[PDB]
Design a protein around this ligand. Structure first.
Ligand SMILES: CCCC[C@@H](CN[C@@H](CCCC)C(=O)N[C@@H](CCC(N)=O)C(=O)N[C@@H](CCCNC(N)=[NH2+])C(N)=O)NC(=O)[C@@H](NC(=O)[C@@H](NC(C)=O)[C@@H](C)O)[C@@H](C)CC
Lengths: 99, 99
């Protein structure tokens, strides 16, 4: 698709058997999801932006479907105010910014 | 251009006759720049990010070039960790996300 930017670019995702809404964020290095269970080992991470940092759990090799497009990569889980799809998964679905 | 997302989507901007680097950010409603001087009166605004909320100064109808493309619009100035070009100006330069 071509997604214009008049509104926030929200899409449906499927992760860990669950449907969620998430923001396509070219300004995010990483993908960050609100609290949920994921399989495998994890390690803690601190991630920052406007307002400072939050602590998250890093899970690797997680399969996600983003607007119908499957992507595997790292997902961070924690008290984010918004589910965010960051560049680590945007690249995998072939997303580009065009102007 | 077509900007891929394997690296941060950093571009050069021009504001107040000065070149700066900024991040093209589809996950940002607004454009937020690190402390600098702009002309005119400002109005207060609170914005939110990953970590919480911060206060910024809102300047309207600021002339700004983004990767060579001319825009005139609202610029927020405050303690952002990074200069970000948000959707208010991405729409002025005709940017879309495509996959
Ligand atoms: C300034 C730092 C770079 C840009 C920023 C854009 N992220 C979006 C996230 C979505 C909201 C949580 C954002 O902050 N958007 C703001 C930008 C400010 C603005 N006004 O435009 C926004 O739209 N804020 C809205 C409110 C959105 C709330 N949304 C919601 N509740 N669903 C606002 N009007 O105040 N990126 C980030 O916050 C990411 N940070 C990073 O990628 C890097 N960190 C740093 C410090 O650069 C990396 C080294 O970790 C986070 C997610 C970690 C991976």
């Amino acid at each position: 698709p071509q997604i214009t930017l008049w509104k926030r670019p929200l899409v449906t995702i499927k992760i860990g058997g669950q449907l969620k809404e998430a923001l396509l964020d070219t300004g995010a290095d990483d993908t960050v999801i609100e609290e949920m269970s994921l399989p495998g080992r994890w390690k803690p991470k601190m991630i920052g932006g406007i307002g400072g940092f939050i602590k998250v759990r890093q899970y690797d090799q997680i399969i996600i479907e983003i607007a119908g497009h499957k992507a595997i990569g790292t997902v961070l889980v924690g008290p984010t105010p918004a589910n965010i799809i960051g560049r680590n998964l945007l690249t995998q679905i072939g997303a580009t910014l065009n102007f």
